[PDB]
XYZ file of C-alpha atoms in Angstrom:
24
model
C -80.090 -105.691 89.914
C -83.110 -106.580 87.932
C -84.883 -109.899 88.277
C -82.983 -111.157 85.308
C -86.007 -110.643 83.040
C -87.597 -107.211 82.558
C -83.943 -105.876 81.851
C -83.033 -109.089 80.345
C -85.331 -108.874 77.418
C -84.463 -105.184 76.892
C -80.779 -106.178 76.522
C -81.603 -108.019 73.256
C -83.394 -105.031 71.773
C -80.197 -103.102 72.660
C -82.061 -100.809 75.085
C -79.804 -101.854 78.062
C -76.548 -102.161 76.177
C -74.554 -100.506 78.914
C -73.599 -103.412 81.201
C -72.384 -105.319 78.152
C -69.951 -103.115 76.411
C -67.691 -100.951 78.555
C -67.263 -100.208 82.275
C -69.082 -96.947 81.902
């Protein structure tokens, strides 16, 4: 898991929209 930051800011841009949609 990321330090709830680098990947946290990318979640807003939609970059990391995989762990917030479906099981995938």
